[PDB]
Design a binder for this molecule. Structure first.
Ligand SMILES: OC[C@H]1O[C@@H](O)[C@H](O)[C@@H](O)[C@@H]1O
Ligand SMILES: OC[C@H]1O[C@@H](O)[C@H](O)[C@@H](O)[C@@H]1O
Ligand SMILES: OC[C@H]1O[C@@H](O)[C@H](O)[C@@H](O)[C@@H]1O
Lengths: 125, 126
């Protein structure tokens, strides 16, 4: 139920404790790198970070954040299981979550899955 | 923020049934009747206010639970139990636990321990 997500740059997705934007910048999966996968119905998932708040696509208007008190939507994603065992996340605007290779804060405004939009993942506690 | 859904491990959501008859854990998706506002009911306990503005009642375990009480007394106060596996359970004032009954019958509050049907995944929704 709780997972981490490892980006194209081998770092781990970081909630940043809900302060500012999320980054794919952590060397190891610790507390801020763990997300509870929420079954939001109709095949959609949400992600609840270490702070008990929810990940938002921000509709691509700014880098993604983990600060929402409740799920609606911008907070539900398609979980895409790629052939190589990786995962991609499709936001409500139809765009994909991108690690941006750790070069900037995580975004959800790219319309296609390339390398920066594939995450390795595992259940952990 | 304080409005939540409860998903039983049959993967269905707890349903207020709009206050008509007993509550069931039978909804495929969390919509209006599946949202419950968590109300501080004092002394660390909580109440659950359903879509119809009325409160969830354990009925003291003597019949299936309902969501029709206009005000809080009790059979309407519960312990919110944070389980180690990230799920939650709800302890009625009779010491028993809310059970999904695997969706095979209406929801109950008369089992004395947390087992498989008494753990719920939860999230705050709008
Ligand atoms: O508590 C652990 C957290 O502490 C922070 O200082 C680190 O940047 C996070 O990566 C880590 O998850
Ligand atoms: O309802 C669509 C979206 O509206 C925005 O103003 C909120 O920031 C999002 O959290 C929400 O999902
Ligand atoms: O949309 C409001 C409600 O409609 C009913 O027909 C369904 O059984 C509920 O699950 C739902 O919440």
């Amino acid at each position: 139920k709780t997972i981490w997500l490892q980006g194209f740059n081998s770092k781990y997705v970081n909630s940043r404790n809900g302060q500012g934007a999320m980054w794919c910048d952590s060397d190891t999966p610790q507390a801020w790198e763990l997300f509870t996968v929420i079954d939001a119905g109709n095949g959609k998932i949400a992600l609840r970070g270490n702070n008990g708040l929810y990940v938002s696509s921000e509709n691509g208007e700014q880098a993604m954040t983990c600060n929402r008190p409740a799920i609606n939507g911008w907070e539900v994603f398609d979980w895409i299981s790629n052939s190589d065992g990786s995962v991609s996340l499709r936001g409500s605007n139809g765009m994909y979550v991108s690690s941006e290779n750790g070069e900037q804060a995580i975004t959800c405004n790219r319309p296609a899955i390339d390398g920066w939009e594939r995450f390795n993942w595992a259940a952990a506690t």
